Amino acid sequence: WVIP
Amino acid sequence: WVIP
Amino acid sequence: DSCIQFTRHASDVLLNLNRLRSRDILTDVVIVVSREQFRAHKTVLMACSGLFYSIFTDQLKCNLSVINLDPEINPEGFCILLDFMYTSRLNLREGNIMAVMATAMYLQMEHVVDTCRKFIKASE
Amino acid sequence: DSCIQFTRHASDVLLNLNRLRSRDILTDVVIVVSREQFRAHKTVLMACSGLFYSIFTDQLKCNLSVINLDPEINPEGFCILLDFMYTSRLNLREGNIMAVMATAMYLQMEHVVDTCRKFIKASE
Ligand SMILES: O=C1Cc2cc(Nc3nc(Cl)ncc3Br)ccc2N1
Ligand SMILES: O=C1Cc2cc(Nc3nc(Cl)ncc3Br)ccc2N1
Ligand SMILES: [Cl-]
Ligand SMILES: [Cl-]
């Protein structure tokens, strides 16, 4: 999971 | 396009 | 093999599937969550959820145009997860994390369940 | 928004759609290319091809279970492109590049046409  |  | 690969292909496919959903094109099922209805593509639901995979591979249920979820399922939690299925983006907030995790466990969406458990553990 | 994103989601969705294709699950159309037949999901074809997007948004053609391609279309070129649609991998070889490019132009698959033109320009 990432900060888009 | 890349070499997978 | 000696194949080449187009990096953005999977993302572009999903973006187009979401455009079809937004315009209600070739949607083939309605998911009923209490008083709310959500139109979607059976194939996309199956590709994202262990529960929908089991439902639509069933020889009788595969032909249903309406699927009613368990009444304990929250429509907002379902909406957030349906958006995630079609975009890879999860709108996870303090106010919705419990409903989102409960819905992801029911829908059998393992990666969503994992990030919810981690975000909850960080706030305790 | 304040969304988080699961990097591998789009790839995992496409991998699952390809698994459904391999087991012939929920395929809803046959594409006829001369003597050959290819089963697929209309939504995936539309998401990858400008030609299939136009065909299945047509109020009459959207309901067809069989689509016949132009007889000039090569079944191997089509097969290579159908595999690309469901995997992001293109099996481009000296022996098939001309048929693949001609098929991608007909199917309106711009990124495939672009790499074919580049590979051809390099060998001249
Ligand atoms: O957390 C998750 C997400 C998910 C998706 C599917 N979907 C499919 N699985 C397989 Cl093996 N083949 C085709 C399809 Br469609 C099955 C289980 C799960 N569990
Ligand atoms: O080279 C390409 C690939 C492709 C795909 C689509 N598909 C869609 N396009 C739009 Cl804008 N919305 C929903 C869908 Br499905 C249209 C044109 C093209 N040209
Ligand atoms: Cl997931
Ligand atoms: Cl393309």
Give the separation between CA C70 and CA D80, rounded to whole angstroms.
Answer: 43
E strand segments, C66-108: 66-68, 89-90
- CB-based contacts of C4: which residues, under 8 Å, 6+ apart? B1, B2, B3, B4, D89, D90, D92, D115
Selection from C94, D116, C50, C83 nearest residue D124 by Cα: D116
State the sign of the Cα–Cα–Cα–Cα dihedral D98, C3, A4, D12.
Answer: positive
Give the separation between CA C29 and CA C45, rounded to whole angstroms.
Answer: 10
Q: Please report, for the domain that includes residue C64, its CATH number.
A: 3.30.710.10
Query: Mutate which of C43, C44, C112, C115 to disrupt the D interface (most D C-beta within 10 Å)?
Result: C43
Nearest residue in chain C measured CA to CA from B4: C5
- CB-based contacts of D60: which residues, under 8 Å, 6+ apart? none
Nearest residue in chain A measured CA to CA from C90: A1
3-state helix, strand, coil in chain B (%, to 5): 0, 25, 75
Give the separation between CA D89 and CA D94, rounded to whole angstroms.
Answer: 16
3-state helix, strand, coil in chain A (%, to 5): 0, 25, 75
Q: Which chain D residues are closer than 8 Å to C11 by Cβ?
A: 10
Give the separation between CA C43 and CA C33, rounded to whole angstroms.
Answer: 19
Type and span of the H or E element at C111: helix C110-123
State the sign of the Cα–Cα–Cα–Cα dihedral C6, C10, C11, C15.
Answer: positive
Residue type, C99: A
Nearest-CA distance from C120 to chain A in Å?
A: 15
CA of C53 to the centre of ligand 1 (A): 6
- A partners (3+ CB pairs within 8 A) are C, D
Host domain of residue D2: 1-124
CB D39 within 8 Å of CB D82: no
Q: Is the CB of C47 under 6 A from ligand 1?
A: yes
CB D96 within 8 Å of CB C1: no
Give the separation between CA C69 and CA C34, rounded to whole angstroms.
Answer: 8
Burial of D95 (0-12, 13-18, 19+ CB in 10 A): exposed
CB C26 within 8 Å of CB C44: no
CB D101 within 8 Å of CB D113: yes
Q: How far is CA D17 from CA C75, D31, D87, D95, in A?
A: 26, 17, 9, 29
Q: How many helices (H) and strands (E) does chain D have?
A: 6, 5
Residue type, D51: L
CB D53 within 8 Å of CB D46: yes
Looking at the structure of chain C, the number of domains it has is 1
State the sign of the Cα–Cα–Cα–Cα dihedral D31, C23, D16, C51.
Answer: negative
- C-alpha C33 chain-centroid distance: 13
Resolution in A: 1.8
Contacts by C21-26 with C-beta closer than 8 Å and gap 24+?
C21/C86, C25/D46, C25/D57, C26/D42, C26/D43, C26/D46, C26/D56, C26/D62
- CB-based contacts of D32: which residues, under 8 Å, 6+ apart? D66, D67, D68, D69
Coil vs helix vs strand at C7: coil
Q: Phi-psi category of D116—alpha, beta or left, where left has phi over 0 and alpha has psi -120 to 50?
A: alpha
Burial of C56 (0-12, 13-18, 19+ CB in 10 A): buried
Chain A CB within 8 Å of residue C23 CB:
no
Chain D CB within 8 Å of residue C66 CB:
no
CB C92 within 8 Å of CB C104: no
Q: Which chain A residues are closer than 8 Å to C111 by Cβ?
A: 1
Q: How far is CA A4 from CA C88, D18, D24, in A?
A: 10, 26, 35
Nearest 5 degrees, angle CA D55-CA C89-CA D89? Answer: 50
Give the separation between CA C15 and CA C10, rounded to whole angstroms.
Answer: 9
Return the ligand 1 atom nearest residue C47 CA.
15
